[PDB]
Amino acid sequence: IRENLKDSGLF
């Protein structure tokens, strides 16, 4: 899921 958070940019 790291790619989903990576998109948020909050991680």
Determination method here? NMR
Q: How far apart are CA 10 and CA 2, in angstroms?
A: 11
Q: Are 11 and 5 in contact (CB under 8 A)?
A: yes
Residue 5 CB partners (closer than 8 Å, separation 6+): 11
Provide the residue type at 9 as one letter: G
Q: Which residue has the tokens 């948020």?
A: 8
Q: How far apart are CA 1 and CA 3, in angstroms?
A: 5
